[PDB]
Amino acid sequence: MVEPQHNVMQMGGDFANNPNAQQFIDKMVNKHGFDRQQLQEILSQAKRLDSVLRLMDNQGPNGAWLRYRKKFITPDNVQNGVVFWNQYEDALNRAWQVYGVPPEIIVGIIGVETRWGRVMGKTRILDALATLSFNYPRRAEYFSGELETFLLMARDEQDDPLNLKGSFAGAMGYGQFMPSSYKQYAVDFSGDGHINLWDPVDAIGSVANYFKAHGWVKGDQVAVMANGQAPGLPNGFKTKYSISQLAAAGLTPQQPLGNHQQASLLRLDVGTGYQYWYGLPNFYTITRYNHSTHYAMAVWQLGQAVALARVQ
Ligand SMILES: [Ca+2]
């Protein structure tokens, strides 16, 4: 009946003779009460994906912004965004009330991430995380922490760890949450007692919670386009200047900046020239999801495009 298999100490598969896999198993048994044999059976089936390693290694004016933008803001995406918004309007309104994060932001995030569930990833999370944890020295510690959290998540939500699929980095569901984000920010917004990253209602609430946790200020402006050019100043979502310094550089805000006394200097390559913007705190909050000016600007404008298409 019961087979302890204490004598079965060596696993097969792609990670069969991997010291890192061995230490990881020891950590899981010692720290979380995992059964060594059960974990070896799971990891023996895990695959080392060289494509995952290659991708992790892989990461004017000529119209840069324009090319990036058109990958996301298209008639098909805006129309599908409208459908998702209307279909999950209650969840979106509830997220606005509970977290102060507006529907266009959540709709924009889920649209840029997975096109509202159409592209959620085809890689087994276990394969990606074991590959990155056991055969990638550069970020081995970070991904080992993710694999740990993933296996704990699977155990708790009662999922077979080998059934879940996602990105080459192990990101999951509608919002493409990493295991650590599931742990720190995912909420059971649907109220069934389970946190499911593949349930659009849960994902909606989880994205909203993530935003509020990262400082989203309800009702505050995201960014305001500037009149003028500021070629002498370094730009990017990480920059920071007082409104006074930006004015001295030849900029004026197209909309009143309220009480904001500083801002980041954003610059978009619109082909014919450069379009400068005053980046406000909420814009930076969007970059917390993906450290990129283009990313955050596309999330915001896609959400705006859907909001408008809904009014029609
Ligand atoms: Ca749920």
Read off the CATH number of the domain in which 36 is found: 1.10.8.350
> What span, in angstroms and rounded, lies between the C-alpha atoms of 230 and 296?
21
Q: Which residue has the tokens 């493409």?
A: 176
Q: Do residues 70 and 141 share a domain? A: no
Contact partners, residue 11, CB within 8 Å, separation at least 6: 21, 40, 41, 43, 44
> What span, in angstroms and rounded, lies between the C-alpha atoms of 190 and 94?
11
Residues measured by CB to lie within 5 Å of ligand 1, the ion: 188, 190, 192, 194, 202
Q: Which residue has the tokens 């061995």?
A: 22
> What span, in angstroms and rounded, lies between the C-alpha atoms of 92 and 174?
14
Query: What is the Å distance from ligand 1's center to 135 Cα?
Result: 34
Peptide bond into 61 cis (omega under 30): yes
Let me know: does 146 contact 80? Beta carbons within 8 Å: no
- Strand order from edge to edge, sheet including 274-279: 236-242, 262-269, 274-279, 223-227, 252-253
Q: Do residues 230 and 286 share a domain? A: yes
The token duo for 258 is 């309220």
DSSP assignment letter at 137: G
67 within domain boundaries = yes
Let me know: does 240 contact 216? Beta carbons within 8 Å: no
Q: Which residue has the tokens 């087994």?
A: 124
Q: Is the Cα dihedral 186, 189, 190, 194 positive or negative?
A: positive
Q: How many domains does the chain have?
A: 2
191 within domain boundaries = no
5 within domain boundaries = no
Query: What is the Å distance from ligand 1's center to 51 Cα?
Result: 33
203 within domain boundaries = yes
Method: X-ray
Query: What is the Å distance from ligand 1's center to 23 Cα?
Result: 34
Query: What is the Å distance from ligand 1's center to 91 Cα?
Result: 12
3-state secondary structure of 227: strand
Q: Do residues 112 and 153 share a domain? A: no
The token duo for 234 is 């370094």
Let me know: does 301 contact 66? Beta carbons within 8 Å: no
* CA-to-CA separations, 255 to 202, 227, 279, in angstroms, rounded: 35, 10, 12
Where does a domain end: 131, 160, 186? 186
Nearest Cα neighbor of 267 from 256, 279, 258 is 279
Cα dihedral 48/138/176/122 (nearest 10): -20
1 within domain boundaries = no
Query: What is the Å distance from ligand 1's center to 197 Cα?
Result: 8
User: CB 89: neighbour CB atoms within 10 A?
Assistant: 12
Alpha helices in 74-123 (DSSP H): 75-87, 89-99, 103-114
> What span, in angstroms and rounded, lies between the C-alpha atoms of 160 and 151?
9
Q: Do residues 282 and 145 share a domain? A: no
Q: Do residues 131 and 71 share a domain? A: no
Cα dihedral 80/85/88/94 (nearest 10): 160
User: CB 261: neighbour CB atoms within 10 A?
Assistant: 9
Q: Do residues 71 and 55 share a domain? A: no
Q: Do residues 49 and 70 share a domain? A: no
Q: Do residues 212 and 291 share a domain? A: yes
* CA-to-CA separations, 154 to 150, 187, 198, 205, 296, in angstroms, rounded: 6, 15, 13, 20, 31
Q: Which residue has the tokens 């930006």?
A: 246
The token duo for 81 is 């965004």
Q: Do residues 45 and 93 share a domain? A: no
User: 88: domain range?
Assistant: 60-118+199-312
Where does a domain end: 152, 186, 220? 186
243 within domain boundaries = yes
Q: Do residues 25 and 134 share a domain? A: yes
Q: Do residues 70 and 160 share a domain? A: no
The residues annotated as belonging to the active site are: 113
Environment class of 7 (CB within 10 Å of its CB; exposed 0-12, middle 13-18, buried 19+) = exposed
For the chain, how long is the longest CA-to-CA vector? 80
> What span, in angstroms and rounded, lies between the C-alpha atoms of 139 and 130?
12
277 within domain boundaries = yes
**CATH number of the domain that residue 84 is part of:** 1.10.530.10
Where does a domain end: 136, 155, 186? 186
Report phi then psi at 263, rounded to 5. -170, 160
Cα dihedral 284/286/196/128 (nearest 10): -80
Query: What is the Å distance from ligand 1's center to 311 Cα?
Result: 30
> What span, in angstroms and rounded, lies between the C-alpha atoms of 211 and 206?
9
3-state secondary structure of 216: coil
78 within domain boundaries = yes
Alpha helices in the chain (DSSP H): 19-32, 36-44, 50-57, 64-69, 75-87, 89-99, 103-114, 125-134, 140-157, 179-185, 200-213, 243-248, 281-287, 293-311
Q: Do residues 147 and 177 share a domain? A: yes
